[model samples]
Target: DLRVGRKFRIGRKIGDIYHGTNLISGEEVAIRLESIRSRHPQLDYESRVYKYLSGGVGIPFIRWFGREGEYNAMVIDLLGPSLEDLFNYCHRKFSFKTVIMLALQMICRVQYIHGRSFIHRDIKPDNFLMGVGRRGSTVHVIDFGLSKKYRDFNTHRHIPYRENKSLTGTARYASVNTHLGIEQSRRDDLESLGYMLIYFCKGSLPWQGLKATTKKQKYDRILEKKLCISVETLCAGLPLEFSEYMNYCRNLKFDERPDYLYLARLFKDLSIKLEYHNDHLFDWTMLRYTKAMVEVLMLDTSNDSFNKVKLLAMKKFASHFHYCKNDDKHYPTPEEIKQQTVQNNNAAPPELLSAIDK
Candidate 1:
């Protein structure tokens, strides 16, 4: 789908990956790209934003062409594969320390974006672009469509809590506070960033126990008490320090999460400590690193219950590498799996389902 000569217009572009539209097939029944742009001014404003903050961020500008009265799209500068792509390509590409560095790097970018008086409303893996994995781990945050700039730091707003819209960025990566539509802050970005780090470190979302429909209920339940869940209860093989960091980030109260400055210092310190270990003490064996990476990739590659094509694609991914590919290898085909994962009702992880019967 990479065409260079005449410039591919709008709907067809590399990583022109939409929020809910099909990436490969380009088929969407409910949401059209243009229509989304019209409703969500953030998407349209994103095209104009990166340019204003280019010097501070050290990342490529995500640009597009638009006219005054005409409804048009702009072209963006997509420099390299995203961090997610690199992470997926080689599961062992980043160590725990480097993963922290990546997270720090991401936070720095967010800080810079906020510094310029703009809030990058969309702070997901899909929004940011990255260079080659370890060799060229360059990063530039992109897609500021939902990006909003404030005249002052105290520029606060509130969104009426919607039961379904809680999945604005999907429950897995989004923070519980964000779902309530309280007020958007730099902390919200860190909460989402924390989830991304968890994916990279331990390979899944936090408290995946809740359903998409019940995300609001889950938030209410957690907030009624402390909104705390045992990291050990959700997944395994996580670094204790990392788990502590995630637990703090996933706090029901927005202020409970670490500030960007603290996060920056923590990660920078972690990077230094990790570098020391890599140099003098011990580095993970190539085999162990590879195994860890592969395991996460298998689990977090993409949610299987989302799109039928993605489910089929996940099955394809599993069959090609999963050791038990032949056992319990079942999935829906292309037509059956049409709705997005956020829209899908079957949100339970298979193991959770099996445990109920046991």
Candidate 2:
């Protein structure tokens, strides 16, 4: 059973989200509750898509789903703030290092979905979130409500392109092909990712807040702006790889499989040239923890009360595992040391014990 808590977001038209706790193991979760009478029914389809793509990583884990009292309910892993929220929080601009690091992981996510033969039509900052605790640095993709299977995973055939398939994702980050009513495929997802990379760098897109009275008019103006601006202009002041990435995505044929490796390598090479660590520590990492705290596992904060016991515990554990300073006097007698040796040998796992043996 999952105990529901405060509404995460109240009345948002399609569905309302809530915080939930797993009554069995006390794990936290996010709940999505969509009414049975909603204009578009997507929860079940989203659930099935989740089940289909979950074999891969960099996506949320769906815990439970069901129909409950005039609503379709789903419980998913609780994630940290979305990239959109972080973008806004970080003064709307992500450093190039952070953007490149994000691209490495974010590209993997899109590739993973494409690996499952599904195209996540929505590829925007709002749909990407960071994980929590030990997995905090992972950029996970979510919200498969608009996803479509582009091909059979076993076969290499592509989804046939068609016209008039209205915009499915957010306007600011959508592909030019999508804006022109072209059927979205793997290339479109990668192209959207290109826009996101630029968004992280530039803080805003060129086509934002156009003078359009209606959604269609706004989309039309966005399309026009995207066409008017060259990749070079859009990527000016940024790395040439950014411009190259934009060009690569823009030039990809609708049915062609995007060279995922090429996209990853572009940033990989850029990060190398720029001397980035790509160590999973992003710009937001410093936003939460101090630089000193993040760089070292055991900071010498002996005087600090909050970390005193925690530090002592880590030290004790390290000593138990033989990582601490050696002191022969700490042991009592020869027989006693021998007993402890036997007990430690018994307690150690096979892999670690074997490593010690070697």
Candidate 3:
């Protein structure tokens, strides 16, 4: 009885996800069902938001509809497994190179949403997804259900900070401010990104198995652990930039705009230090090859398709790779570089201070 249009033939249901095939184009699609809650009056508007989006950032191509009285559902381009799945598949370890690439792409997606004035309040490993088939090498961010506007549409000013707001994101990945019951902002989103990076590097967080009798107790323990532990200890075996990232986001005022270009450049430098090539190979790429399910020679560097991928990669990471410097060896504009220096005061994270000192 699954009927949106005659063009789609209904298939099996995997958890809440329904598989279908477009009859006309023989294209496969995934439909996710969510019972419309009274709190979400912006479901239709959210659909419009996703519809207008087009870029290298991997989000669902959302087409929203309702099943009359039952539930609201969104049909999107079926994507591949998530980073969490791949993490488990890789025996709970991602190489530093893979983690850096993932972080860059994930940041690109977050940057796009923030550009639109929306904060993805819930950012975790499950929300960061991998593309399927030919798009497998790419990563996409999904699930905007918990997203909220961080700026006023008319005034163009940051939303005023509020206190004692209900926590919205997953507890393990929630920011310290979230634990403090403060309103979420871009910094909180970025803080979640920092935790996600640590999770990718360490496979699990230090606060994973606290004994608690109630959910609230668990969350409290996790929060205390998050605030009490120094970022250096939390990111001990991982890269120092990860600690710097957590510190930077944790210290951001509720309204300050994040220096996005600076953050992306940090990872770009790390990629260079690690000597990572832009070959687009990922954990899943190698995983499939190892399983003998896919051929090893999928990329044809000279082909137009491969060139398109390269161009998309450049555009996605344009903040890092595209901006600044010319044949004349000119630098970023005077105001831009000056802002970087002004923001480089002692309040800056330790790693950033070290960067400025050099």
For 232-287, candidate 1 gives per-residue lDDT tens digits of 54324433445555665666453232367766666566545333222211112232
- Cα lDDT of candidate 2 equals 0.72
Q: Which tens-of-lDDT digit does each residue in 182-247 have in candidate 3?
A: 999999999999888878776778888888998778888999999898776687655556767887
The alpha-carbon lDDT assigned to residue 68 of candidate 2 equals 70
TM-score of each: 0.55, 0.76, 0.76
Question: What residue pairs clash in candidate 3, if any at all?
Answer: 58-140
Q: Which is the leading candidate under lDDT?
A: 2
Model 3 deviation from the true structure expressed as Cα RMSD, one decimal place:
13.1
Q: Model 3 — which ten-residue stretch has the worst lDDT?
A: 322-331
Question: What tens digits encode model 2's per-residue C-alpha lDDT throughout 1-358?
Answer: 3333322222222227777776667666778888899888998899888878766788788887877767788777888889998887656777666788889998998988988889999999999989888888888898898999899777867878799988987899989999999889988899999999888877688888788789998998999999999776677556667788999988998788789899899889866665557677665555444323333334333125323322332222221211111222131222332243344344422332233233
Off by over 4 Å in 2: 1-15, 153-156, 290-358
For model 3 the TM-score comes to: 0.76
TM-score (C-alpha, index-matched) for candidate 2:
0.76
